[PDB]
């Protein structure tokens, strides 16, 4: 049986009169202020491998690629998966980068080093170039075979389009709810020009179940309550639902 493919996502409710949208990003970044609490669990959930030796993989469509500041990208310590029309121009850049990318991280582990800190096996930092979704799996099973870890399709509203239409992978939503925090007894809503692709079927589960906080935790290998806990102005929960 074939391994699970998992989306990964914060989105806001946007309640329209036909349905409740879900927003996940304006003008090619994210739609809120930095949420550290969301950030943190997005990066220690992505980087922790399934089990020792291996490396997860994040697949994304160039444009988030191009959403993370440059000087942090590629994303470390996981394989980027960069999907793109353009593998040619893309790939150069992104060799580019990851370039400057190992220069920042071997200056990082020479002075760890110097200043006697303990160092250990760890997932290894990639990226790569694809020029579709089924490409970037295919191309990330070839390069890496037994040592790629879980696979996560990081978006954006393109790419995980593209992942809920692939052809029956268990496919599987780790999502991070933001709302604003009411001011008076209201809440106000975020403005975004980009959806999650399916929101409704979620909220309303149909086709997709909700699943409980403990399969979240299995999933993602870290405790997940799907409580709401409070971030400055917004609050956030981490909730799961898988297909039927
Ligand atoms: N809140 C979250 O969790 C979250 C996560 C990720 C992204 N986002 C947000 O979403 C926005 C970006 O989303 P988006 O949907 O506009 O962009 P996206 O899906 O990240 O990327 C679109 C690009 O991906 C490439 N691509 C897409 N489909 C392809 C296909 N079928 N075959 C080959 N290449 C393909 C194309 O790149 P080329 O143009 O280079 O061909 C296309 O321009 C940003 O605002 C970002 O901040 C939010
Ligand atoms: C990276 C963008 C694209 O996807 C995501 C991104 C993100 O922002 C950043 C920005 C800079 C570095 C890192 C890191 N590491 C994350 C946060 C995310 N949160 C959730 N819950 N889901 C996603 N898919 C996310």
Known sequence: ??????????????PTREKTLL????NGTLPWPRIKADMSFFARVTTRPPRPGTTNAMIMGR??????????????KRINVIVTRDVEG??????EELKEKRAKMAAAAAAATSAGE??????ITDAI????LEAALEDVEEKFKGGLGSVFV???????????????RPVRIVMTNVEKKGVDGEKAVFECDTFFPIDEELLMEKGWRKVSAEEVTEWVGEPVSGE????????????GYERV
Request: hydrophobic share 35%.
């Open 118 to 123: 303990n160092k250990e096996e760890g997932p």
């Open 90 to 95: 893309v790939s150069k850049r992104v060799a």
């Open 154 to 168: 990081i978006g954006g509203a393109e790419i995980y389009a593209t992942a809920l239409g692939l052809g029956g």
């Open 1 to 14: 049986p074939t391994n699970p493919l998992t989306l990964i996502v914060a989105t806001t409710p946007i």
């Open 129 to 132: 170039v694809s020029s579709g």
């Open 23 to 26: 927003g996940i990003g304006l």
């Open 63 to 76: 444009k988030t690629y191009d959403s993370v500041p440059k000087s942090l990208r590629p994303l470390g």
């Open 228 to 239: 709401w806990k409070d971030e400055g102005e917004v609050r956030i929960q981490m909730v």
